[PDB]
Amino acid sequence: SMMRWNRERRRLQIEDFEARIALMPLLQAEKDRRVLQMLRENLEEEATIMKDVPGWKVGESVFHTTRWVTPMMGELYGLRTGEEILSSTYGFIWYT
Amino acid sequence: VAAFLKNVWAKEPVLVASFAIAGLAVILPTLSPYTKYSLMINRATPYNYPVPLRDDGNMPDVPSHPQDPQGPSLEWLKRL
Amino acid sequence: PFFDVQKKLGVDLDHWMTIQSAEQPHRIPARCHAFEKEWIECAHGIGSIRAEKECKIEFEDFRECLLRQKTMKRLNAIKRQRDKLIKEGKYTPPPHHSGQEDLRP
Amino acid sequence: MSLVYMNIMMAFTVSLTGLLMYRSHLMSSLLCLEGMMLSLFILATLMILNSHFTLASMMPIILLVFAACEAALGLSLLVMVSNTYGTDYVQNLNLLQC
Amino acid sequence: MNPIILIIILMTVMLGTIIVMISTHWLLIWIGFEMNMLAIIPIMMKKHNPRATEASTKYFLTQSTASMLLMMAIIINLMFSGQWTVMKLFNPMASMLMTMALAMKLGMAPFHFWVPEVTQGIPLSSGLILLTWQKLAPMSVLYQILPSINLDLILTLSILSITIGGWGGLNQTQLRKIMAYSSIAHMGWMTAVLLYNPTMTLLNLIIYIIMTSTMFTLFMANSTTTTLSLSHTWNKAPIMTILVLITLLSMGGLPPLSGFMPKWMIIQEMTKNDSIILPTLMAITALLNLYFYMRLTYSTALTMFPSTNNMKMKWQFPTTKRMTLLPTMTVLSTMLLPLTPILSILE
Amino acid sequence: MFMINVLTLIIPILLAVAFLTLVERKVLGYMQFRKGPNVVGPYGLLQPIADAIKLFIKEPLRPATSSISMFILAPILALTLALTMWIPLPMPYPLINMNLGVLFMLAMSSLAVYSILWSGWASNSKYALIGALRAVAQTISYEVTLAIILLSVLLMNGSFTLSTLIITQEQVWLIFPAWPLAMMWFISTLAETNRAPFDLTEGESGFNVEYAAGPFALFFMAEYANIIMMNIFTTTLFLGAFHNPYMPELYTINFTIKSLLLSITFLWIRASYPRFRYDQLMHLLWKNFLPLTLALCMWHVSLPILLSSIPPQT
Amino acid sequence: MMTYIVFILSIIFVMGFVGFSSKPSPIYGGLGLIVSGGVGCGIVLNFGGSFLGLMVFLIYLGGMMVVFGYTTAMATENKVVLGTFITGLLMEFLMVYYVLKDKEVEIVFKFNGMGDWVIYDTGDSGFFSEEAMGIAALYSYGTWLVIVTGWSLLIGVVVIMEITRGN
Amino acid sequence: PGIVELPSLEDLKVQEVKVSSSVLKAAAHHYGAQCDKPNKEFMLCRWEEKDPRRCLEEGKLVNQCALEFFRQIKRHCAEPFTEYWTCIDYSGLQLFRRCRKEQAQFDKCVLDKLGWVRPDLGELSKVTKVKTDRPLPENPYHSRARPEPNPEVEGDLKPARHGSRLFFWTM
Ligand SMILES: CCCCCCCCCCCCCCCCCC(=O)OC[C@H](COP(=O)([O-])OC[C@H](O)COP(=O)([O-])OC[C@H](COC(=O)CCCCCCCCCCCCCCCCC)OC(=O)CCCCCCCCCCCCCCCCC)OC(=O)CCCCCCCCCCCCCCCCC
Ligand SMILES: CCCCCCCCCCCCCCCCCC(=O)OC[C@H](COP(=O)([O-])OCC[N+](C)(C)C)OC(=O)CCCCCCCCCCCCCCCCC
Ligand SMILES: CCCCCCCCCCCCCCCCCC(=O)OC[C@H](COP(=O)(O)OCCN)OC(=O)CCCCCCCCCCCCCCCCC
Ligand SMILES: CCCCCCCCCCCCCCCCCC(=O)OC[C@H](COP(=O)(O)OCCN)OC(=O)CCCCCCCCCCCCCCCCC
Ligand SMILES: CCCCCCCCCCCCCCCCCC(=O)OC[C@H](COP(=O)(O)OCCN)OC(=O)CCCCCCCCCCCCCCCCC
Ligand SMILES: C=C(C)[C@H]1Cc2c(ccc3c2O[C@@H]2COc4cc(OC)c(OC)cc4[C@@H]2C3=O)O1
Ligand SMILES: C=C(C)[C@H]1Cc2c(ccc3c2O[C@H]2COc4cc(OC)c(OC)cc4[C@@H]2C3=O)O1
Numbered sequence A: 001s002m003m004r005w006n007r008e009r010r011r012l013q014i015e016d017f018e019a020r021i022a023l024m025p026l027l028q029a030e031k032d033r034r035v036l037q038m039l040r041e042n043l044e045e046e047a048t049i050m051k052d053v054p055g056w057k058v059g060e061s062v063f064h065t066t067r068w069v070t071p072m073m074g075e076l077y078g079l080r081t082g083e084e085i086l087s088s089t090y091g092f093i094w095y096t
Numbered sequence B: 001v002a003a004f005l006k007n008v009w010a011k012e013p014v015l016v017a018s019f020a021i022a023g024l025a026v027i028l029p030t031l032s033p034y035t036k037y038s039l040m041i042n043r044a045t046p047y048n049y050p051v052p053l054r055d056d057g058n059m060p061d062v063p064s065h066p067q068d069p070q071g072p073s074l075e076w077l078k079r080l
Numbered sequence C: 001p002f003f004d005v006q007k008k009l010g011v012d013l014d015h016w017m018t019i020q021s022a023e024q025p026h027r028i029p030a031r032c033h034a035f036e037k038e039w040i041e042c043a044h045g046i047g048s049i050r051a052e053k054e055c056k057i058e059f060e061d062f063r064e065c066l067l068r069q070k071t072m073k074r075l076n077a078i079k080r081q082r083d084k085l086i087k088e089g090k091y092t093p094p095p096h097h098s099g100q101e102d103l104r105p
Numbered sequence D: 001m002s003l004v005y006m007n008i009m010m011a012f013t014v015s016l017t018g019l020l021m022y023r024s025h026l027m028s029s030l031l032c033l034e035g036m037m038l039s040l041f042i043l044a045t046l047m048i049l050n051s052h053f054t055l056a057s058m059m060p061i062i063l064l065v066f067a068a069c070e071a072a073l074g075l076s077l078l079v080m081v082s083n084t085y086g087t088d089y090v091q092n093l094n095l096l097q098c
Numbered sequence E: 001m002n003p004i005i006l007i008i009i010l011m012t013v014m015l016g017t018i019i020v021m022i023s024t025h026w027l028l029i030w031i032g033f034e035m036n037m038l039a040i041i042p043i044m045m046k047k048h049n050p051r052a053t054e055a056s057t058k059y060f061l062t063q064s065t066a067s068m069l070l071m072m073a074i075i076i077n078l079m080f081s082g083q084w085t086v087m088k089l090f091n092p093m094a095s096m097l098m099t100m101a102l103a104m105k106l107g108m109a110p111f112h113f114w115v116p117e118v119t120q121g122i123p124l125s126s127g128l129i130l131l132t133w134q135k136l137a138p139m140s141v142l143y144q145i146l147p148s149i150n151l152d153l154i155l156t157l158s159i160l161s162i163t164i165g166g167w168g169g170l171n172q173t174q175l176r177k178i179m180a181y182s183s184i185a186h187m188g189w190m191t192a193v194l195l196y197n198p199t200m201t202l203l204n205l206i207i208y209i210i211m212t213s214t215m216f217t218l219f220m221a222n223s224t225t226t227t228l229s230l231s232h233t234w235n236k237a238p239i240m241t242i243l244v245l246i247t248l249l250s251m252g253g254l255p256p257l258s259g260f261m262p263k264w265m266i267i268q269e270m271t272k273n274d275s276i277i278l279p280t281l282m283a284i285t286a287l288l289n290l291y292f293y294m295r296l297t298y299s300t301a302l303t304m305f306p307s308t309n310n311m312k313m314k315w316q317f318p319t320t321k322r323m324t325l326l327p328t329m330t331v332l333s334t335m336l337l338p339l340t341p342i343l344s345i346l347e
Numbered sequence F: 001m002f003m004i005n006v007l008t009l010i011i012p013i014l015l016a017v018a019f020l021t022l023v024e025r026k027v028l029g030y031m032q033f034r035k036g037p038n039v040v041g042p043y044g045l046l047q048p049i050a051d052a053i054k055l056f057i058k059e060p061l062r063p064a065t066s067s068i069s070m071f072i073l074a075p076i077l078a079l080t081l082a083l084t085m086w087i088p089l090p091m092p093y094p095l096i097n098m099n100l101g102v103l104f105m106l107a108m109s110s111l112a113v114y115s116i117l118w119s120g121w122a123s124n125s126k127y128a129l130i131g132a133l134r135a136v137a138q139t140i141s142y143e144v145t146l147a148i149i150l151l152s153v154l155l156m157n158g159s160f161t162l163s164t165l166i167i168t169q170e171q172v173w174l175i176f177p178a179w180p181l182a183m184m185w186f187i188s189t190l191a192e193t194n195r196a197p198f199d200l201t202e203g204e205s206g207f208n209v210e211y212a213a214g215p216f217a218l219f220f221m222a223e224y225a226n227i228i229m230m231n232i233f234t235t236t237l238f239l240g241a242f243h244n245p246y247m248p249e250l251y252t253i254n255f256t257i258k259s260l261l262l263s264i265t266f267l268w269i270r271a272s273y274p275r276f277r278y279d280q281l282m283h284l285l286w287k288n289f290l291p292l293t294l295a296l297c298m299w300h301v302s303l304p305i306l307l308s309s310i311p312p313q314t
Numbered sequence G: 001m002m003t004y005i006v007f008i009l010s011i012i013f014v015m016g017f018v019g020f021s022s023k024p025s026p027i028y029g030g031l032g033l034i035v036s037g038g039v040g041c042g043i044v045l046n047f048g049g050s051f052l053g054l055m056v057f058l059i060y061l062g063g064m065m066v067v068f069g070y071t072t073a074m075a076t077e078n079k080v081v082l083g084t085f086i087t088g089l090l091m092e093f094l095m096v097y098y099v100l101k102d103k104e105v106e107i108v109f110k111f112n113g114m115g116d117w118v119i120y121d122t123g124d125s126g127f128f129s130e131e132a133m134g135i136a137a138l139y140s141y142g143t144w145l146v147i148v149t150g151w152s153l154l155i156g157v158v159v160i161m162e163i164t165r166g167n
Numbered sequence H: 001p002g003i004v005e006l007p008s009l010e011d012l013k014v015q016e017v018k019v020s021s022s023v024l025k026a027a028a029h030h031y032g033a034q035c036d037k038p039n040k041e042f043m044l045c046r047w048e049e050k051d052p053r054r055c056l057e058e059g060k061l062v063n064q065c066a067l068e069f070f071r072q073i074k075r076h077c078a079e080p081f082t083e084y085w086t087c088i089d090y091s092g093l094q095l096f097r098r099c100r101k102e103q104a105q106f107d108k109c110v111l112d113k114l115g116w117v118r119p120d121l122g123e124l125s126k127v128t129k130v131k132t133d134r135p136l137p138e139n140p141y142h143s144r145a146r147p148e149p150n151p152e153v154e155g156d157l158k159p160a161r162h163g164s165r166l167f168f169w170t171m
Helices: A002-049 A082-094 B004-009 B011-030 B037-044 B075-079 C033-043 C048-053 C054-066 C067-086 D003-020 D026-051 D054-082 E001-024 E026-044 E050-079 E092-106 E115-121 E124-145 E151-168 E175-192 E196-222 E229-232 E237-251 E260-268 E278-304 E326-332 E337-345 F003-032 F047-056 F068-084 F102-108 F114-121 F126-157 F164-168 F179-192 F215-237 F248-268 F278-306 G006-020 G026-045 G051-073 G080-102 G132-136 G144-162 H021-025 H028-034 H036-049 H053-073 H079-090 H100-113
Strands: G102-106 G111-113
Touching: A002 B075, A002 C067, A002 F047, A002 H021, A002 H036, A002 H053, B004 B011, B011 F278, B037 F278, C033 C048, C033 C054, C054 C067, C054 E050, D003 D026, D003 E050, D003 G006, D003 G026, D003 G080, D003 G111, D026 D054, D026 E050, D026 G006, D026 G026, D026 G051, D026 G144, D054 E026, D054 E050, D054 G051, D054 G132, D054 G144, E001 E026, E001 E124, E001 F215, E001 G144, E026 E050, E026 G144, E050 E115, E050 H021, E092 E124, E092 E151, E115 E124, E115 E175, E115 H028, E124 E175, E124 E196, E151 E175, E151 E278, E175 E196, E175 E260, E175 E278, E196 E237, E196 E260, E196 E326, E196 E337, E229 E278, E237 E326, E237 F248, E260 E278, E260 E337, E278 F215, E326 F278, F003 F047, F003 F215, F003 F248, F047 F215, F068 F102, F068 F114, F068 F215, F102 F126, F102 G051, F114 F126, F114 F215, F114 G051, F126 F164, F126 F179, F126 F215, F126 F278, F126 G051, F179 F215, F179 F278, F215 F248, F278 H036, G006 G026, G006 G080, G026 G051, G051 G132, G080 G102, H021 H028, H021 H079, H028 H036, H028 H053, H036 H053, H053 H079, H079 H100
Parallel strands: none
Antiparallel strands: G102 G111
């Protein structure tokens, strides 16, 4: 009985993973626009904040390479409120 | 071979059952025909995204769509 | 002495946990996979003496990916100037950085 | 760098200075040694989880297992001292000065 | 101890040293040291007396503290390099902690304060294992991290080991403590030439292991643990006094003996690198250990001694003790200097 | 709203532990050809209330303790661990739904021996300390087979998730492929909670004979707060009930009935046998349960591979 | 205040070690190391190392410190202690005041004073914990590691039975 | 170093698929069946460019083709799809297995009114090939020039000139 039911459960797991796979391009596109949205907003707010500071280049990369670096958590949620910060940094860990 | 075995089955049946189940657990996956399908199911389980290939021009064994007849299939798993 | 038994016999005892760029379970990348790959491919075969001076930029990019000291320093500077302009009152936060805009996706 | 790493290293150095110069119970020395192991576990875990380096996730368990076996070995030495003097006072371990 | 279990435990000591020698991952280095310590603890408690329990507890605490410092060094290496290769380190703090931890495992000064005690508390065969086989693994790790070793730290530890091993054995009548301060002095001699030429470090390691193995094998062959019992050897076996003569003359560095071979080469590799004062005062301190060796063989090995009547019973029995490799080790510990360019096989 | 869920977890735990004393005394009474309490309440229903009030107004000892602070920390740790064991239990939904609830419960039940050890420390009686050390060695002995049996079963579960274990037994009870694991598990949980035939705290004087009626009623009830939990855990582990997601109370009635029958099975075991000698249950663990448990752990490692029945990871 | 919770636990962790390295007794030293193991385990659990946190609870606290308390019970039946305690506590709180008034500190290394929520990653890992699959890799990729660890534990059993015999 | 280039907010505006995860999960098999080509062109561009800024327009095509996927559901089979994703939406793990008759009604109405065949077990996890016109990135890591390797050993091995040359040892 456990043989038949675990084979059935592996088939069901493959079905769930293929639903995930079929949804992953849309989630990837939304995630890319999400992070570029947050970086562009942080760039404009840095451009309107960091004018008093001399010798400051707004949006200056800290990396010597020109390759795209995946944005860090404090790069994206660095200028937002503590509720969204706490959600995005410990929500999954603290979820139930 | 049966006097010592009946003697240990009369004195220590716990250890006889222990060594027998342990011996079966060791030797039986080398004799089962279903041990191949364990490997086959654990490699058929798509944890990652099936990253597509750039069509160079000559890849006949790669499908152009999930519903195309070429590629790996799981009919062996749907039947079993 | 480093008696290289693993290369002489051709066995892989512990090369697999050695770097982050190695084959991981389920193709999980490390966070600094690209930086460590670039620094390893720079420093390969040229020896450690030439690697310490000729692969400095890849190693600085990789160490700064690992520790994020420059990124946290820049975030400190921006957040500190922002706190100064909030205390002075010459700046106000926008509605998308105060939490009043109902996020995108 | 990260600020929690400073606290874990400071904990390691506190238990290291607690091990080194006190001349007290031997069990207190083993407790300082396993506090050093605890701080190494926490620090290795936070680094490996921080960098998402997946194959080293089995590394702190190894760091646990060996060292806990090490701890067992130390207790047995203590028990042999506890079968010799009746105490684990390390000033009873002065036969080998001469 | 059951001889099968003794074989298994000695193979585990050897296996831990091999894992430190061959592995490319720092965790396996740490594992090999843990395996080596865990396996060597029963070899010290072979006779089951309170001195061996004290010696094993002190050895456990020193090697455990050293292993924790080694793992902290590995962990800071992981912070600042994100990887695990047993090569040069990527932080001077990891360099300092790993040099300190390996100095604790070798018994170098200022962490020398267990080596005369532990060697005193354990038998001669386990002291042989401690002073010869337990030097191989940390010298291998020091051999592989020498691009990161701070020169001032390794030279401070080296000359401190040489001075303390010199001025610690002047007072000693116990043979195991003489060998232990000799160990500390020779580890100073090995680690001072490490950043200049590591092949001469390996040469000093092998010549030291040969001479130490010769000395402990003669000690087991005569069952002498003190100076005064060593003086009672000529009336039992006269050749054994000759062999402890020539081997103690070799360990201090007399020409034309083989123990003059490493340190002369070490001076030969330190003046190339324009260091003149350091090997000078280093060999000045080695003259002090040679000098108490010459007191310990002139006053108390050559000129023949008052004996005891029960020794005339011991004339009627030969040595049935297995003196394994003792003539080979005695020839190699004395007569090897004409083959001084053999060192190139260690390159 | 979550605090209401925590309270409706933990207050009915203490009420069920209170009335478990009545069920114990009544069921032991009728098995011993007599009655249990029937005077104090109608059918004895006010006996635990009168007993708890009676204990809470007795004079405590407050003896000369080696540690006052650990004399305080032993009931607090006992009750806190006895209440936190229930929070991942899926009935059919848990208070805290966590991915590693099985390993959580294993770790928190391993933490329960400090109550016994600190209660042996806090009494100055060295014989109470001896009995505490024997109790601790008993409990850490049977934790080994708890861990290995639980590992062998979770090889058929697929994860450490306690709610997945309901999905695992949707066709068959897990006592059918794992009844030798189930019977060694049941006897090992019996030996975890210092429960007869494994109790060594009534005769050759236990670790908690220093406590009188202030902390004792708490210790005891924390102890019975483990017992029901272990049976509920056994009910989740080998006797998985039907779960309809649109009517969860079908699962709640079904697992409640099975857990009641299994706690009554504890009561029915202790009324039927004499006790073990201490080295006899050490002989039972180290020489009878542990070789079989290792053999069946090898069997449940190799068995899903040889039948192509490896369970899902998620 | 909730954003710094890992940091807050780390402070308690440091305090916990100064709680027991002052060493009033191996009894209270064990108690301080158990509380320290709990709070450092909370540190580990707050980064997503749930299996490693339950290895702290099951094996370090539930397995090994039980044996330390057991041996402290059976084998082992002020001014220096309280002074070292308050000395280490004053050192740690002055460090906290420095790093909170400066958001930058240098004792040995350079350390940022913001919270460590910034240094995380913004991605997901699908249907698995990466830490769980990395520990599962002990049986597939970690063959030599399993061999040397099992041999060390077997030798550990043999070594304990040798030196505890006394014969 | 340099300034990191970011696209403007107008370059990121696209009409979002503003439906829930159970709605996406309900139609996910027919989504992977019918929206194959733009999704795979996007994920090919996304694993090859290694840069989301170079993957905006293909991503917009994803968000162009997903919405047309749902409009084509909303014009034809809104009620069986709604009855299906509501049942998917009840479950805390979102089980497909609890919802087979609503799945059958949705699949029946989709095959009748749209001709779509649901993918089988093992199809959407296939590695497929993608014919695009965009060029292959010649340096996706933006790596600089690698250092030149050390010169290898060549030449036949001669004996040592007068031996070790160690002080007086002539061999
Ligand atoms: C067609 C195919 C077949 C053809 C067959 C032809 C041959 C037929 C005859 C077969 C026998 C051949 C014998 C070996 C070849 C000749 C060796 C020779 O004379 O070397 C000259 C060698 C240098 O002279 P040369 O004019 O430059 O070379 C002439 C030849 O062309 C020498 O050749 P080289 O120029 O190539 O020399 C190379 C180089 C030349 O050397 C150098 O470049 C300088 C480095 C030498 C080492 C310096 C070390 C100093 C510190 C240690 C001192 C130890 C204490 C002194 C000895 C105490 C007792 C052990 O050698 C070395 O560096 C190796 C070390 C020296 C080994 C000498 C051979 C020893 C074999 C017998 C051992 C018995 C004890 C001998 C003395 C041991 C001390 C050396 O002389 C010395 O170094 C002085 C020592 C005396 C030589 C040994 C004579 C061997 C026969 C002894 C019989 C009496 C034994 C009495 C009982 C035992 C003693 C108590
Ligand atoms: C979870 C739901 C409930 C589970 C069942 C439990 C309910 C019933 C409880 C009854 C009261 C128990 C009170 C406590 C009793 C404790 C004492 C006791 O029983 O000790 C255990 C005794 C101990 O032995 P012993 O004490 O009887 O004998 C003394 C020991 N010797 C002989 C060594 C001197 O037995 C066991 O350990 C058995 C444990 C379970 C064995 C499972 C065997 C599986 C069979 C596999 C196949 C075998 C066939 C051959 C091979 C075939 C291969 C294909
Ligand atoms: C190869 C298969 C896998 C093997 C490895 C895995 C084993 C799983 C179980 C682990 C058990 C761990 C402990 C085992 C100890 C064995 C030695 C032993 O117990 O010997 C002593 C015993 C006599 O008992 P005594 O010393 O008095 O102890 C007090 C009890 N009276 O003497 C005995 O009990 C005699 C024991 C030997 C005879 C047992 C024969 C069993 C045969 C079963 C069928 C065949 C199984 C195939 C494998 C062959 C096994 C021999
Ligand atoms: C680059 C590095 C790579 C590796 C290079 C190789 C390094 C070699 C290091 C050798 C270290 C040897 C340590 C001692 C041997 C190990 C086993 C042992 O201890 O054997 C001794 C044994 C004990 O028997 P037991 O009964 O306990 O004796 C008590 C007396 N009743 O029996 C006895 O006590 C009998 C008495 C005689 C024993 C003599 C043993 C001599 C061993 C050393 C040989 C010389 C070193 C090898 C050559 C040089 C290598 C550098
Ligand atoms: C003498 C001192 C006092 C003694 C009496 C009081 C202490 C003893 C009784 C209480 C014991 C507390 C144990 C707390 C941690 C238990 C382990 C744990 O949290 O596991 C559950 C879960 C892991 O599962 P997972 O599903 O992966 O997590 C969600 C991610 N989706 O993980 C999670 O869900 C993570 C949730 C966030 C992190 C939780 C951290 C809890 C606080 C840290 C420990 C506090 C207690 C310290 C003392 C312990 C005992 C000494
Ligand atoms: C928790 C509540 C509400 C009350 C009721 C209660 C306690 C504290 C302790 C006990 C208890 O109920 C019963 C009373 O009678 C026996 C009699 C026993 O044997 C005759 C026996 O054996 C183990 C056990 C017991 C329980 C026992 O100890 O607090
Ligand atoms: C007691 C110890 C440790 C040493 C010192 C010592 C002896 C034995 C003998 C003598 C000795 O002192 C030396 C002093 O100076 C020279 C100088 C010599 O040559 C430079 C010389 O040549 C034989 C002989 C001598 C003394 C000599 O006979 O053992």
